[PDB]
Structures are given as structure tokens and as C-alpha cells.
């Protein structure tokens, strides 16, 4: 996001406003703003890996813009569109990756690729050497907003079960 | 495996008649060792379980959203108002006798996925099979019935 | 794929209600909560399935094989 230091309304503000996002929602639900159409009029700007050494970033769109759960300058130029987007494909599946040890997240990221489920829909027609398809895939009850864009909810991996954490004496 | 690197395998299988059972008559799908929790130190798994329970109760599907304001306290309050123990602990009965279990057990729904390593593909034995041509030793490979 | 039959945990027959469950969310614009509650699923074991089921035969069948 590009942030204009100047503001007639006062202190500082990122240029985009509510009208633009309303137009975006309207365009989407029509089933004519595109991401490109956001680019042209100067609302978001691409940043290569080199520039960051000359830019200050605001994590939240409200972190310091104006004047128990958890722990939370005035010269920002760009604000992150959303922090949860620093992940990749596989890690996006992990629910609450913040709330566990990082190597455990790495273990899961590597392992999830070794899970069955569905891989396409034409498989009844598509020959192949190897193929796994399970009976009753279920979209997990827990989920993040991301994998909706990953079409994951459409093509789930496993199915949830009623687990119990106990030592029932044998195995 | 879970969604948190907590891999594992099946040891044995019981059926309902002797599996531990709750007051409402629900019986668990599978049970894991509590000791697997602290050493690996995966906490988010438990939050997933609790949130999944409350989501199933309300019917409204839950959220993960790595960096957001959702905390455990709201989950506990909502689950409690739905009429269960706030932290998810549950009275539990022993199928063999029906007696009360002295402790309580954390217990709810959780997502799993099946892995690629079925035992049948990995069992292999050999006794006086084919020999290798060059060196007269047993051949290589399970598929080729090697040693 | 076809909605499962005979809920895993408990065993109550599920699937007969599935098509009823769909129209409850179409012309009655209720929530899934009240939908199932009127549908009559006290235990959540019978209920997790209806929540998380993903139809795929809908996508499959709309091919044109032969």
C-alpha cells in the first residue's frame, strides 16, 4: 500500500479509501475494477527486494496511524496489505502457526505434501502411474482465510475426527 | 499426522463397546498419548481442537488467521455459554466397567490426513531367493525380492 | 462425493436429510445452526459431517461421458 504523508484530514493516511474497496466488491459480485485498475491511479506499488533499504513499513493499517489478549515513529511510507501473507502455499494450511514452535511448522509443511485426498477431477479419465483418492474428504472445521484462495476448501486433504487426549493404558 | 507435525501410527484398534465414552454417549475416533504435547511443545494444536469444537456447536465454521486478535478467552466464554466446560475438559467413563474416570480428559474434534506409507508396501522378507549374477550374492530390492 | 451414511462416531443414519438440509439453506435463508437444530442433530458427531461435507459428484457428473 502506498501512504501519502500529507493529509487534508490531518496527520497521515494511506491513499486508498472505502469507495475504492466498495467498487472492488461490486466488481467482484458482478460475476470493472481489476488489480491493474488499482495500479493505474496510484494506490498500490510493486517493491523489489532491493528497495526496502529505503522504505519504512507499517505492519498494521492502524498500528500507529492515529495518535489480556497480547502485546501490540510517524514517518511511514507504505503499509503491509496483510501480515499473514508472508507464508507460502503449504504453510498456509497450518492453523495458528504463530502459536507453536517453528521447527514443528517446518515438519508439517514438509509432511503435508505426503497426504492423500484428491488431486484433480478428471482422474476417472486421466491415466497415470500412481494415484490416491480417498472416500469422504472433509473441509477442516478450523481454517484460515487464505486457503479459500488456494481452492483447498474445494479439494480438502483429509477428514477431521473426534480425538481424545488420554492414556487409555495400552497403546 | 495432525496439522502440527504430530505424526504417528496406529497401535491397535478397539470398538465402541469398550472404548471410553462420554456422558452424551459420544465415543472418540482416536486417542493419542498426552505426553506427546509438552516435549514437542505444539500448543496451537489444542487451540485448533477447542475452536473446532465450538465451531461445530455453533455450526459457524471457525478461523485460524495467523496474525489476528482472536484469543483463547473469547473461545472459552462462547464454549461455556454453549453449555460445556470452559477449557474443554470432559467427564469420561471407562467402557470396561462404566466407573467414573478419576481425572478428566480434554476431548474434541480435530483435522487429520492419511499419509503415504501403508505397512503392506513396506513389509518384506526373504529366504533363499534369487542370486545376483556378478557376485553370487542375494539380489537387491524388495520388488525383486532382494535381501 | 455422496454424503456419508451412518455417522462414524454415533451411527445415526445421515444422508437422507442432506437434500433437505440444502433447501433449508436456500429458500429458508436460515443459518446452518438452526438448520441442523430443526433437522434434529443434538450430538455434534452427527453434525460435523453435515458441516464439513464437500460434494464432488456434482463436479464429476457434469462431464459428458459417452
Amino acid at each position: 500500500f502506498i501512504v501519502e504523508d500529507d493529509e487534508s484530514l490531518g496527520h497521515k493516511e494511506l491513499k486508498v479509501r472505502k469507495g475504492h474497496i466498495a467498487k472492488l466488491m461490486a466488481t467482484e459480485y458482478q460475476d470493472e475494477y481489476t488489480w491493474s485498475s488499482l495500479l493505474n491511479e496510484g494506490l498500490v506499488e510493486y517493491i523489489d527486494a532491493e528497495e526496502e533499504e529505503s522504505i519504512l513499513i507499517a505492519m498494521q493499517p492502524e498500528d500507529l496511524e492515529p495518535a489480556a489478549k497480547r502485546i501490540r515513529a510517524t514517518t511511514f511510507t507504505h503499509c503491509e496489505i496483510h501480515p499473514s501473507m508472508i507464508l507460502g502455499v503449504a504453510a498456509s494450511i497450518i492453523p495458528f502457526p504463530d502459536h507453536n514452535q517453528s521447527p514443528r511448522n517446518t515438519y508439517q509443511s514438509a509432511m503435508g505434501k505426503q497426504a492423500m485426498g484428491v488431486f484433480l477431477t478428471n482422474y476417472n479419465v486421466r491415466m497415470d502411474t500412481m494415484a490416491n483418492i480417498l472416500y469422504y474428504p472433509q473441509k477442516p472445521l478450523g481454517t484460515t482465510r487464505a486457503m479459500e484462495y488456494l481452492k483447498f476448501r474445494e479439494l480438502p486433504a483429509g477428514q477431521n475426527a473426534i480425538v481424545a487426549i488420554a492414556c487409555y493404558s495400552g497403546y | 499426522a495432525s496439522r502440527h507435525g504430530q505424526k504417528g501410527t496406529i497401535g491397535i484398534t478397539y470398538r465402541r463397546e469398550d472404548m471410553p465414552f462420554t456422558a452424551e454417549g459420544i465415543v472418540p475416533d482416536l486417542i493419542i498419548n498426552p505426553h506427546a504435547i509438552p516435549s514437542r511443545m505444539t500448543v496451537a494444536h489444542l487451540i485448533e481442537c477447542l475452536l473446532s469444537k465450538v465451531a461445530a456447536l455453533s455450526g459457524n465454521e471457525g478461523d485460524a488467521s495467523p496474525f489476528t486478535d482472536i484469543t483463547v478467552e473469547g473461545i472459552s466464554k462462547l464454549l461455556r455459554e454453549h453449555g460445556y466446560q470452559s477449557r474443554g475438559f470432559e467427564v469420561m467413563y471407562n467402557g470396561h466397567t462404566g466407573k467414573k474416570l478419576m481425572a478428566q480428559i480434554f476431548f474434541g474434534p480435530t483435522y487429520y490426513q492419511r499419509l503415504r506409507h501403508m505397512v503392506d508396501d513396506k513389509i518384506h522378507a526373504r529366504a533363499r531367493g534369487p542370486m545376483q549374477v556378478l557376485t553370487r550374492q542375494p539380489v537387491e530390492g524388495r520388488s525383486r525380492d532382494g535381501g | 462425493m455422496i454424503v456419508p451414511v451412518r455417522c462414524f462416531s454415533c451411527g445415526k443414519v445421515v444422508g437422507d436429510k442432506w437434500e433437505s438440509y440444502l433447501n433449508l439453506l436456500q429458500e429458508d435463508e436460515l443459518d446452518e445452526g438452526t438448520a441442523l437444530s430443526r433437522l434434529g442433530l443434538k450430538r455434534y458427531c452427527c453434525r460435523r459431517m453435515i458441516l464439513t461435507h464437500v460434494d464432488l459428484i456434482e463436479k464429476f457428473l457434469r462431464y459428458n461421458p459417452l
Binding site: 466488491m25 461490486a26 459480485y29 482465510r145 479459500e148 | 475452536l51 465450538v54 465451531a55 455453533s58 459457524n60 465454521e61 471457525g62 478461523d63 486478535d69 482472536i70 484469543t71 478467552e73 473469547g74 473461545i75 466464554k77 462462547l78 | 439453506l25 435463508e29 443459518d31
Partner: peptide, 20 residues
């Protein structure tokens, strides 16, 4: 104190459709 524990896609779809 829900703090938005849940999100619905079809409900938001219908709400913004009637909003339009």
C-alpha cells in the same frame, strides 16, 4: 466477546447482493 470467531461466504455474498 466473540471478536469474529467465524466467517461465512454465502451469507456475505447474499448480504452484498441485496446491498447492491
Amino acid at each position: 466477546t466473540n471478536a469474529s470467531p467465524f466467517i461465512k461466504r454465502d451469507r456475505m455474498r447474499r448480504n452484498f447482493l441485496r446491498m447492491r
